[PDB]
Amino acid sequence: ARPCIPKSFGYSSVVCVCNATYCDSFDPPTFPALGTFSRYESTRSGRRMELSMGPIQANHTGTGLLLTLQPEQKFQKVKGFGGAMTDAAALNILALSPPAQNLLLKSYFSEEGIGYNIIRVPMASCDFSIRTYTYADTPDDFQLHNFSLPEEDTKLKIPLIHRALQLAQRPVSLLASPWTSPTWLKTNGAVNGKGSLKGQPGDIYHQTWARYFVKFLDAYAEHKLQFWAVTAENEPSAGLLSGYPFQCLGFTPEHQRDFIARDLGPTLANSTHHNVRLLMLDDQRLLLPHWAKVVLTDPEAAKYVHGIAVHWYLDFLAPAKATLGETHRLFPNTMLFASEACVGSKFWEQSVRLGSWDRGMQYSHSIITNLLYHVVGWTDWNLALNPEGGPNWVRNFVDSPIIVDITKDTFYKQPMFYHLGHFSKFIPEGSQRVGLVASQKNDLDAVALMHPDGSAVVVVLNRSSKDVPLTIKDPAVGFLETISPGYSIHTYLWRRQH
Ligand SMILES: *[C@@H]1O[C@H](CO)[C@@H](O[C@@H]2O[C@H](CO)[C@@H](O)[C@H](O)[C@H]2NC(C)=O)[C@H](O)[C@H]1NC(C)=O
Ligand SMILES: *[C@@H]1O[C@H](CO)[C@@H](O)[C@H](O)[C@H]1NC(C)=O
Ligand SMILES: *[C@@H]1O[C@H](CO)[C@@H](O)[C@H](O)[C@H]1NC(C)=O
Ligand SMILES: O=S(=O)(NCC1CC1)c1ccccc1
Ligand SMILES: [K+]
Ligand SMILES: [K+]
Structure with a gap:
């Protein structure tokens, strides 16, 4: 809706400057098309909750890092x-x-x-x-x-x-x-x-x-x-x-x-x-x-x-x-x-x-x-x-x-x-944490939750300097091929058809 106006004060990243006539804001919330995912990305280099979309794919090959959603392994309600x-x-x-x-x-x-x-x-x-x-x-x-x-x-x-x-x-x-x-x-x-x-x-x-x-x-x-x-x-x-x-x-x-x-x-x-x-x-x-x-x-x-x-x-x-x-x-x-x-x-x-x-x-x-x-x-x-x-x-x-x-x-x-x-922004009251299993050892921090209406949200934090390619697998739905840049945080959201 309105992007971040960045300002540096000599620390590692920027603030977003808001005032009487301007502040960064999002559009009204809407889910990506079924078969599509949303990615919100913030980075040290200055991206602030920027939205991109991508396809959920039927297939995946490779020995890269895979995080597999465990939607029936339920933990706490939020x-x-x-x-x-x-x-x-x-x-x-x-x-x-x-x-x-x-x-x-x-x-x-x-x-x-x-x-x-x-x-x-x-x-x-x-x-x-x-x-x-x-x-x-x-x-x-x-x-x-x-x-x-x-x-x-x-x-x-x-x-x-x-x-x-x-x-x-x-x-x-x-x-x-x-x-x-x-x-x-x-x-x-x-x-x-x-x-x-x-x-x-x-x-x-x-x-x-x-x-x-x-x-x-x-x-x-x-x-x-x-x-x-x-x-x-x-x-x-x-x-x-x-x-x-x-x-x-x-x-x-x-x-x-x-x-x-x-x-x-x-x-x-x-x-x-x-x-x-x-x-x-x-x-x-x-x-x-x-x-x-x-x-x-x-x-x-x-x-x-x-x-x-x-x-x-x-x-x-x-x-x-x-x-x-x-x-x-x-x-x-x-x-x-x-x-x-x-x-x-x-x-x-x-x-x-x-x-x-x-x-x-x-x-x-x-x-x-x-x-x-x-x-x-x-x-x-x-x-x-x-x-x-x-x-x-x-x-x-x-x-x-x-x-x-x-x-x-x-x-x-x-x-x-x-x-x-x-x-x-992405975890409504009543969301339930669910499992998320890594296929190999990795430097990322991640959590997965399910909305009350069944939709999925995954947050991935990379506190390392290295860009980490990864795939998220939703066993019902397909694969999200993505990347976790160094010094980034991403939120992924998608609808889950059964
Ligand atoms: C509030 O902040 C905005 C954003 O910095 C100011 O608008 C900018 O003003 C500069 C200088 O005239 C322009 O170069 C930019 O193009 C303006 N940006 C936008 C998005 O309008 C604005 O002047 C500030 N408002 C007050 C009341 O100080
Ligand atoms: C996905 O996997 C199988 C592999 O045999 C194939 O039938 C299918 O065409 C592949 N590609 C797509 C885009 O689904
Ligand atoms: C319990 O509630 C009533 C109000 O209906 C009050 O009058 C009474 O003193 C209360 N008892 C306590 C605080 O012990
Ligand atoms: O995670 S949400 O459902 N957060 C709640 C929102 C009112 C529906 C969401 C969906 C799409 C875009 C931003 C946020
Ligand atoms: K202090
Ligand atoms: K008093």
């Missing part, structure tokens, strides 16, 4: 993809002119963009906020009569969420997560630092905290917003750490288990919001499987927990098989969901690297890795940041797929945007 509407994201989006705001939101939420269907909503303030607040800062208000949404919600976040939902043709699911409780419920009486809820699960402090979740859901419902899920606490391990710099609330896994069993589970289940799902953990993967064991082996907690939320700090190394793999083996009926991912968080790397292909490859490699370990969705962190990677009240700056430059009324779409879009 919930979807999206990102977080933090205070920082909202402020950056609304600092753009109305036309640029629209093109940014269309980029993410419309069918002319990459089709996000998840928005994560912080419950009150976090690090990506410029003001520290909760919804119930008046002390000793245990019945939460003075609970209320401030302007960060009513004037910034909620109107933007409504605008995203208007642009979306896919149903959008909202996920809520709190960072801190009111300080008068906490052992340290501060939003940050080491501290937990006072007392013990089942007591007034814990009951009040559980009621705060229902108050939040009630308040958003008055604005005609309903949630798909809540997490039990953002990064519960953080509040156990001396000097933790920003909003947190510490829970051991035993504390989280008992809070869920005695307070949050029953309180949600007794409310009009009983259909909202509860996700546990919302933290880094090295806490698994231990955290899952502690919480889910208690039947009283387990009956309230619908899923496990995991965060991915892509700058840091940690095992996948010993964490996600083991958790799936031990608790195959509890879904895993990636609720936050980010890059650029190390103090010694530029928070925002405009045009970094490497950071793009980190996003897509992460997503593939998550999907191969049974995870049902993937949620980026801040939807948009400034060129510093902010604002952020403790200067904990990071990268974002969209960077806003208010002085030019411009925003920049990073390689990370396109790497995420290779999945989000």
Whole structure:
């Protein structure tokens, strides 16, 4: 529909420049003719989700790499993809002119963009906020009569969420997560630092905290917003750490288990919001499987927990098989969901690297890795940041797929945007991962899924410098002869006749 306007900032690849009168966009989505496949290609050399079509062939010869679709080998259903509407994201989006705001939101939420269907909503303030607040800062208000949404919600976040939902043709699911409780419920009486809820699960402090979740859901419902899920606490391990710099609330896994069993589970289940799902953990993967064991082996907690939320700090190394793999083996009926991912968080790397292909490859490699370990969705962190990677009240700056430059009324779409879009645009909610078997050892990363309507999607990432010819075999349908260029990502789509 409209191609990428590239700009280089001296990193390995380009950003696409958008402004008040121009942004890259796709045509309305249409499938290739039966017997035809679509290929969307992005490359370090500068291609951005460019469309080509090719024939599906009856025959194949050669000893080249063959990836054979296993359409009846079924794995997880996919919930979807999206990102977080933090205070920082909202402020950056609304600092753009109305036309640029629209093109940014269309980029993410419309069918002319990459089709996000998840928005994560912080419950009150976090690090990506410029003001520290909760919804119930008046002390000793245990019945939460003075609970209320401030302007960060009513004037910034909620109107933007409504605008995203208007642009979306896919149903959008909202996920809520709190960072801190009111300080008068906490052992340290501060939003940050080491501290937990006072007392013990089942007591007034814990009951009040559980009621705060229902108050939040009630308040958003008055604005005609309903949630798909809540997490039990953002990064519960953080509040156990001396000097933790920003909003947190510490829970051991035993504390989280008992809070869920005695307070949050029953309180949600007794409310009009009983259909909202509860996700546990919302933290880094090295806490698994231990955290899952502690919480889910208690039947009283387990009956309230619908899923496990995991965060991915892509700058840091940690095992996948010993964490996600083991958790799936031990608790195959509890879904895993990636609720936050980010890059650029190390103090010694530029928070925002405009045009970094490497950071793009980190996003897509992460997503593939998550999907191969049974995870049902993937949620980026801040939807948009400034060129510093902010604002952020403790200067904990990071990268974002969209960077806003208010002085030019411009925003920049990073390689990370396109790497995420290779999945989000082409994997509708309810898609199911299926097998994909390589005929020989190779350097590629790939995943295959089947749409609800039976159509096929395959994503192929090449993190190597070498162009790799390959064939995809769909045993019902035929062969797709293609090539995976070095430093590329491709998405393949086709109809499957039986
Ligand atoms: C928004 O960006 C577009 C794209 O760069 C700008 O339009 C370009 O303007 C230059 C300079 O006049 C021309 O050489 C290009 O041909 C234009 N491209 C297109 C596609 O129109 C546009 O001026 C910018 N808008 C604002 C309000 O700054
Ligand atoms: C495909 O395979 C068989 C090989 O004998 C042949 O009958 C057929 O003509 C070949 N070519 C095409 C285009 O199908
Ligand atoms: C359960 O729900 C009702 C609302 O119908 C409420 O009045 C009651 O206090 C709730 N019980 C709790 C939160 O324990
Ligand atoms: O994968 S999709 O079906 N994504 C969803 C779209 C609304 C139908 C698709 C198909 C054709 C072109 C782009 C994307
Ligand atoms: K208040
Ligand atoms: K940094």
